[PDB]
Amino acid sequence: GLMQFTLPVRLCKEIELFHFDIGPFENMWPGIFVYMVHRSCGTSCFELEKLCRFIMSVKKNYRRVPYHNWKHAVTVAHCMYAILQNNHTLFTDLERKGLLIACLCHDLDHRGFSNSYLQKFDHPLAALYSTSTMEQHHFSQTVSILQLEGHNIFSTLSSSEYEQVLEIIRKAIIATDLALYFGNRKQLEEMYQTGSLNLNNQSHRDRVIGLMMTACDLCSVTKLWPVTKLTANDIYAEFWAEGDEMKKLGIQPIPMMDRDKKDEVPQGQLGFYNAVAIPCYTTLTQILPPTEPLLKACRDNLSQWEKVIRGEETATW
Ligand SMILES: O=C1NCc2ccc(NC(=O)c3nc(C4CC4)ccc3Nc3cncnc3)cc21
Ligand SMILES: [Mg+2]
Ligand SMILES: [Zn+2]
């Protein structure tokens, strides 16, 4: 308690906004994450020395890829922080402890390739894990790190509590497989509209937490336009590299991964907001009304992509 984390005045205020950007200073991101853990969980949730050792080992096992990198891990974590702070009565002690950690760890050792490419490549991980291939790898990496000497950030939990929080983290990381999101949002939509959704039902909590993980994972579409536009360059750098690797295998890539189809990006973005993003934040807002600013920011960026398609805005590449 004696030593507390503090941010400069601008960061202290703006970190509470859903659309906060964590900035270009990598050396500040560990401090920003600890600050969020102290405020959303408590200063006693973890021993600062173990948490600090854990954070630096996680950082080291993210790779130097354009998008699925250490900055994405902390960005996804910050979106979970904003959801938890604005819904603070709804989550348990273990959920607060597990969910920021799950977000930090959710893309561990990502190489910038989709499950589909690992399948077509016949990558060994595809034989180890037939479904949610990369996500089961991310979880396995989380367990490896937690089992390093001095890295057990959950050391004060009983065996049964430790087992629950690892099960929260496992389900949360697996839910970031966007293939699973379509089914989970459909279920949640029907449960909501038929008035059957029950936050005391553990299988219902799992689905709600899954949707929160999708919303956090996609949260780059919920930033102010200048941040959303520049981040779109990072995701497409990975997609186009995968598309190149698909062509090397003699397989035609899907249009969003073909770097020859760069002029069609604004229409593909429009396609993604309508089929995925807007439905995602809409269902989240129905279940957790204080998450409204995510949906509003998503609608604003959708309107910007339409302005691009009408030639009223220009996307520099
Ligand atoms: O269905 C589609 N038809 C065409 C198309 C094109 C692209 C996409 N996907 C994305 O754009 C996207 N995907 C992810 C998840 C890894 C999957 C996360 C963020 C994303 N966008 C984004 C936007 N702005 C700033 N940062 C990131 C889907 C389609
Ligand atoms: Mg992922
Ligand atoms: Zn991710």
Swiss-Prot record:
Its main location: cytoplasm. Abundant in the putamen and caudate nucleus regions of brain and testis, moderately expressed in the thyroid gland, pituitary gland, thalamus and cerebellum. It is found in: Cytoplasm, Cytosol. Changing residue 107 to A: Loss of activity and of zinc binding. GO terms for biological process: cAMP catabolic process; cAMP-mediated signaling; cGMP catabolic process; negative regulation of cGMP-mediated signaling; regulation of adenylate cyclase-activating G protein-coupled receptor signaling pathway; regulation of cAMP/PKA signal transduction. One of its GO terms (molecular function) is 3',5'-cyclic-GMP phosphodiesterase activity. A divalent metal cation 1 binds at residues 72, 106-107, 217. A divalent metal cation 2 binds at residue 107. Homodimer. Belongs to the cyclic nucleotide phosphodiesterase family. It is linked to Dyskinesia, limb and orofacial, infantile-onset: An autosomal recessive, early-onset hyperkinetic movement disorder characterized by axial hypotonia, dyskinesia of the limbs and trunk, orofacial dyskinesia, drooling, and dysarthria. The severity of the hyperkinesis is variable. Striatal degeneration, autosomal dominant 2: An autosomal dominant disorder characterized by striatal degeneration and dysfunction of basal ganglia, resulting in hyperkinesis. This is cAMP and cAMP-inhibited cGMP 3',5'-cyclic phosphodiesterase 10A. The chain holds residues 724 to 1040 of 1055 of the full protein.
